[PDB]
Amino acid sequence: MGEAPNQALLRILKETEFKKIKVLGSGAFGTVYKGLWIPEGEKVKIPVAIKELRATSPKANKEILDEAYVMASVDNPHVCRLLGICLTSTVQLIMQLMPFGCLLDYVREHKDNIGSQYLLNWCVQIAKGMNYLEDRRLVHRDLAARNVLVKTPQHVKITDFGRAKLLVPIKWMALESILHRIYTHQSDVWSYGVTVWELMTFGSKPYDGIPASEISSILEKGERLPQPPICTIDVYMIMVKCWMIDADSRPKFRELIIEFSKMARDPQRYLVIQGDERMHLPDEEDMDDVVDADEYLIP
Ligand SMILES: C#Cc1c(-c2cnc3ccccc3c2)c2c(N)ncnc2n1[C@]12CC[C@](NC(=O)c3cncnc3)(CC1)C2
């Protein structure tokens, strides 16, 4: 016995059980649709996001089903679970609709109305989700602001298990990952560091202008990302601790939960943002029987 048996349920969804309403976005990753899932026996309507790829190949469906595996194996409030799969020629992955999109886009568009309370609560929530993945022996290998989804402004979740492994994004990776392809829970802490830096700069591109091949030399010299204008030394020290050369010297995710949650009790002591007190963030026939997927638990 090396590990415990994974007794997760892979739910297979009929094409008749759900309907694509519209396209949300297109990319290299694929095509994501907004939709409504209606389980046949129940009287519920569950808002969903359906992920297709751009052209069916065996290597594509291999990679889709590996994502499904990992995503069906997780259950935590700050981690995106897979609701099910649909067996089209190319496999479709179905999850919870996250109305406000990814956190990177959210901070760029809502830069002017994001308080210190929100930023620090997001740091806690991401640390909780990452700590859960560490408890499940899962290294994420691709934590970034683009792979955090926003259910509400008060509630974010980690996504993207396309690179997640059971124990390329050069500008989010630890030094040992770039040089030697070594990936641990502590290399995810580096990427957490860069993720926090993205949020505190309202979605700036890290090392903007510099090409990816020069990054390893930059980090070996001792250079790191700059202190964001809004950050106190207290917050920037946490980011700098995530980017230590010694991986064991970096914080644990459980420690990051503690540090940010202490800071979240008194947010204006740790982030300095102009006009912080003023900051506010938020079919008819469908709305009658709408249950959010987090309240629709497995029979
Ligand atoms: C990638 C994806 C994605 C996902 C998702 C992730 N992983 C998945 C894994 C398995 C199965 C399905 C998955 C679905 C997602 C979601 N569940 N709910 C809302 N949106 C989502 N997106 C986005 C697609 C376009 C989008 N656009 C904006 O955020 C935007 C742009 N411009 C102005 N405002 C907002 C960027 C990401 C929203």
Distances (CA, A) of 171 to 22, 117, 291: 33, 27, 39
Residue-range domains of the chain with CATH: 15-97 (3.30.200.20), 103-269 (1.10.510.10)
Strand, coil or helix: 253: helix
Helices and strands, number each (H, E), in the chain? 8, 9
Of the candidates 152, 254, 240, which has an alpha carbon nearest to the alpha carbon of residue 193? 240
CA dist., res. 223 & res. 226, Å (int): 9
Told to judge if 142 belongs to the known catalytic residues of this protein, a careful annotator would answer yes
Q: Is the CB of 291 under 6 A from ligand 1?
A: no
CA dist., res. 26 & res. 163, Å (int): 20
For atom 2 of ligand 1, the residue with the nearest CA is: 32
Q: Which atom of ligand 1 is nearest to the CA of 101?
A: 29
Of the candidates 273, 281, 21, 38, which has an alpha carbon nearest to the alpha carbon of residue 151? 281
In the set 105, 142, 188, 234, the catalytic residue is 142
Q: Is the CB of 70 under 6 A from ligand 1?
A: no
Residue type at position 94: I
Element (H, E) at 123: helix 116-135
The values of phi and psi at residue 220, to 5°, are -60, -40
211 contact partners, CB below 8 Å, separation of at least 6 = none
Element (H, E) at 134: helix 116-135
Please report, to the nearest 10 degrees, the dihedral formed by the alpha carbons of residues 96, 100, 101, 103 taken in order.
Answer: -120
Rounded to 5 degrees, what angle do the CA atoms 145, 146, 150 make? 80
Burial of residue 295 (number of CB atoms within 10 Å: 0-12, 13-18, 19+)? exposed
Structure-determination approach:
X-ray
Best mutation site among 149, 150, 160, 294 for ligand 1 pocket (most ligand atoms within 8 Å of CB): 149
Q: Is the CB of 79 under 6 A from ligand 1?
A: no
Of the candidates 48, 109, 39, 38, which has an alpha carbon nearest to the alpha carbon of residue 80? 48
Of the candidates 131, 155, 159, which has an alpha carbon nearest to the alpha carbon of residue 145? 159
Q: Which atom of ligand 1 is nearest to the CA of 32?
A: 24
CA dist., res. 142 & res. 187, Å (int): 10
Query: Furthest-apart CA pair in the chain: how many Å?
Result: 62
Rounded to 5 degrees, what angle do the CA atoms 82, 85, 90 make? 130
Q: Is the CB of 101 under 6 A from ligand 1?
A: yes
Burial of residue 278 (number of CB atoms within 10 Å: 0-12, 13-18, 19+)? exposed
